Design a protein around this nucleic acid. Structure first.
Ligand SMILES: [Mg+2]
Ligand SMILES: [Mg+2]
Ligand SMILES: [Mg+2]
Ligand SMILES: [Mg+2]
Ligand SMILES: [Mg+2]
Ligand SMILES: [Mg+2]
Ligand SMILES: [Mg+2]
Ligand SMILES: [Mg+2]
Ligand SMILES: [Mg+2]
Ligand SMILES: [Mg+2]
Ligand SMILES: [Mg+2]
Ligand SMILES: [Mg+2]
Ligand SMILES: [Mg+2]
Ligand SMILES: [Mg+2]
Ligand SMILES: [Mg+2]
Lengths: 141, 25, 180, 82, 218
RNA sequence: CUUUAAAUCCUUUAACGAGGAUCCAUUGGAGGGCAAGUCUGGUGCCAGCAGCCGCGGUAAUUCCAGCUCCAAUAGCGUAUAUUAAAGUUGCUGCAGUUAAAAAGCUCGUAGUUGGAUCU
């Protein structure tokens, strides 16, 4: 059982922080290795240069080709695979063009079918992908 | 609806089971 | 450094469960019955009632002879009686916990304008207020969410600069009279 | 049971076990309400009224119902001393 | 037309027992749903909480049955819960309604603070348990409503509680255990020995003693 | 006019100013979680959707659209940090037979705790 005496505050506090270090989320947030290894560097979004268009096999129970792009982040040069969400949207992207990339939705964890992919393209050449998809804006020339 | 009970009882575990159960309650 | 103030509040809170049949139906009933624009007005009234209930609950746990309890309980009861939500014969603290949202919704200028017969519907009442046809005492009031004080209720008129009260025809009457 | 006004706001008042003073619940079917016919002091005959005891299911399950009823009858004078 | 089989049914039909609380007083088992229909037929409502398909593996395939959970109760003082499993959903619902009627227990209601008006909340903090699910009801101030999950909220509103605080622990995802636990907590409200019930009980006559002759000749 | 250092805005007042009152509300959804269509056309494990479970292999309630519907509404989606949910850090208040877990065993300093009793 736990100590319960009136003079046990230091024991309780020290035990709580030591055991707190055994929590996955707490250790991830406070250890500093996760932030160092994060390609975004703790940012919500990032900007990168499209290196090549790639097709990724969907996971086994469902068969499909997910259209992604290899991007090189400007701020640190790290290379990333980012998912281009809607259909035909890969045709809006060219080679060696500016792209704004965001997270995929689960804090650096792969989402759904696409394996080892945790980023999605938000902007292509400073115009939103949604606007291009819905015909609100056209690709700048 | 009795049709809901029938469509659920035909396939208790199927593509439409959850919707029909939600309708039943 | 500037000479500005930054005190501000949120007047409503949002429900934790976004989609549930009972809450949605009850809110829609209130909106339709009192001619409200959206659910934010319902949540605003709910928030004021919740703050009042929280204050009353804080006061109840105090001692009956505690001067703070006496002081702020008297103030709260007098504020609630003054706007017409509470009855003077029910001026005990616990009765505050018996108040409902409809009591606060009935004291709006929109519902009172409808009840006094100045308008033939709650929506007609809202458009009458927003169109500067309604005055309270001598001040033309433009805000539907104007909680009418109990003493101020007897002075709600048609705003004698308006066509319905002051007999000056508006744009449409003037234009249609020029066509003759 | 009583509010400030003074009337009894309660659906019903349940019986308590005469042995353990526990409340006998609405759905507790091991409980019993025994009636014992006391006898007149001259003719040794049943005279019409009686003394009633109530025991909950727990006491009966523990096997202590017999001793409890024995003591309740002893305190009532139904059972002679020793 | 109802033809009673049990002694209690005959007494109830023959206009001898005037209230369900007389049956609750002597903890008599109720085995005929027509008794509940006779006493609270007008005010009773039902609500199918869940339909769950259960499967039994067999040499050729899975035999599937359907389990219905039904909560019943007039929204003043009474509530019941019933679970029935059958080969057809409609039969399961009918049986669950019958069982819920057979399981109607009285609910004791108290006050949070001042005892002004009708009782509105639970008399005290109560707890129900059913297979790793623990449900705790806490008295709440007037006008607070029911602060609970939807499944216990249905039963609490159906019983007649206006205001209640709730805390639940365990695997509440199992609707059956959650419902049975909140039902157990509700049922415990009249088994708590509060000081107002310290007065020594005055024993009355059971219906089987009051109407022995009428039962003899009927 | 008023405002103001001078103005602007707001307030006050002339004149004009509404029937598709075109003086035209959007952003997200419609299998479950979770409110709202196993309606119609196209595609056919492709394109794609899908936070999770899953949907799509020729009769798709899930994709691409039309219609309809619903949530909030001058706002509403998305990414990330954080809080509640989390009694999943547990002081309140968690666990350690078999689900993760009691040191192989004993001694022992510090620490923590420590039986009545006095008007
Ligand atoms: Mg919990
Ligand atoms: Mg679970
Ligand atoms: Mg739309
Ligand atoms: Mg669609
Ligand atoms: Mg959904
Ligand atoms: Mg639904
Ligand atoms: Mg999404
Ligand atoms: Mg869907
Ligand atoms: Mg947290
Ligand atoms: Mg908590
Ligand atoms: Mg645990
Ligand atoms: Mg182990
Ligand atoms: Mg050992
Ligand atoms: Mg030591
Ligand atoms: Mg001592």
């Amino acid at each position: 059982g736990k100590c319960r005496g009136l003079r046990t505050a230091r024991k309780l506090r020290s035990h709580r922080r030591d055991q707190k270090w055994h929590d996955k989320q707490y250790k991830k947030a406070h250890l500093g290795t996760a932030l160092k290894a994060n390609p975004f560097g703790g940012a919500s979004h990032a900007k990168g240069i499209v290196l090549e268009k790639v097709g990724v096999e969907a996971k086994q129970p469902n068969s499909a080709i997910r259209k992604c792009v290899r991007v090189q982040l400007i701020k640190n040069g790290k290379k990333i695979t980012a998912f281009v969400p809607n259909d035909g949207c890969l045709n809006f992207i060219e080679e060696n063009d500016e792209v704004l990339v965001a997270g995929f939705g689960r804090k650096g964890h792969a989402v759904g079918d696409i394996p080892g992919v945790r980023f999605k393209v938000v902007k292509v050449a400073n115009v939103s992908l949604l606007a291009l998809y819905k015909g609100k804006k056209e690709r700048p020339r | 609806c009795p049709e809901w009970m029938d469509d659920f009882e035909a396939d208790p575990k199927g593509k439409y089971a959850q919707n029909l159960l939600k309708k039943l309650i | 450094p500037v000479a500005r103030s930054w005190v501000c509040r949120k007047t409503y809170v949002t429900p934790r469960r976004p989609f549930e049949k009972s809450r949605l139906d009850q809110e829609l009933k209130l909106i339709g019955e009192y001619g409200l624009r959206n659910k934010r007005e319902v949540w605003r009234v709910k928030f004021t009632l919740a703050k009042i209930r929280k204050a009353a609950r804080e006061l109840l746990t105090l001692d009956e002879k505690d001067p703070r309890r006496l002081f702020e309980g008297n103030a709260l009861l007098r504020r609630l009686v003054r706007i017409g939500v509470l009855d003077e014969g029910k001026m005990k603290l616990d009765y505050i916990l018996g108040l409902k949202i409809e009591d606060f919704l009935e004291r709006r200028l929109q519902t009172q304008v409808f009840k006094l017969g100045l308008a033939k519907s709650i929506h007609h009442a809202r458009v009458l207020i927003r169109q500067r046809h309604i005055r309270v005492r001598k001040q033309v009031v433009n805000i539907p969410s104007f909680i009418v004080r109990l003493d101020s209720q007897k002075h709600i008129d048609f705003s004698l600069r308006s066509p319905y009260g002051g007999g000056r025809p508006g744009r449409v009457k003037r234009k249609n009279a020029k066509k003759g | 049971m009583q509010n400030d006004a003074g009337e009894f706001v309660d659906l019903y008042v349940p019986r308590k076990c005469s042995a353990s003073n526990r409340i006998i619940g609405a759905k507790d079917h091991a409980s019993i309400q025994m009636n014992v016919a006391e006898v007149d002091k001259v003719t040794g005959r049943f005279n019409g009224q009686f003394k009633t005891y109530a025991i909950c299911g727990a006491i009966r399950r523990m096997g202590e119902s017999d001793d409890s009823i024995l003591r309740l009858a002893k305190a009532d004078g139904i059972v002679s001393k020793n | 037309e109802w033809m009673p089989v049990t002694k209690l049914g005959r007494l109830v039909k023959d206009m001898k027992i005037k209230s369900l609380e007389e049956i609750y007083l002597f903890s008599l088992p109720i085995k005929e749903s027509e008794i509940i229909d006779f006493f609270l037929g007008a005010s009773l409502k039902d609500e199918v909480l869940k339909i769950m398909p259960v499967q039994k593996q067999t040499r050729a395939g899975q035999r599937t049955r359907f389990k219905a959970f039904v909560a019943i109760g007039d929204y003043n003082g009474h509530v019941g819960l019933g679970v029935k499993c059958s080969k057809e959903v409609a039969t399961a619902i009918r049986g669950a309604i019958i069982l819920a009627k057979l399981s109607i227990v009285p609910v004791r209601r108290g006050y949070w603070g001042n005892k002004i008006g009708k009782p509105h909340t639970v008399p005290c903090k109560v707890t129900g348990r059913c297979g790793s699910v623990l449900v705790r009801l806490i008295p709440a101030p007037r006008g607070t409503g029911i602060v609970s999950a939807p499944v216990p909220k249905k039963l609490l509103m159906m019983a007649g509680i206006d205001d209640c605080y709730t805390s639940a622990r365990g695997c509440t995802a199992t609707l059956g255990n959650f419902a049975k636990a909140t039902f157990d907590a509700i049922s415990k409200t009249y088994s708590y020995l509060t000081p107002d019930l310290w007065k020594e009980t005055v024993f009355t006559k059971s219906p089987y003693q009051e109407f022995t002759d009428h039962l003899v000749k009927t």
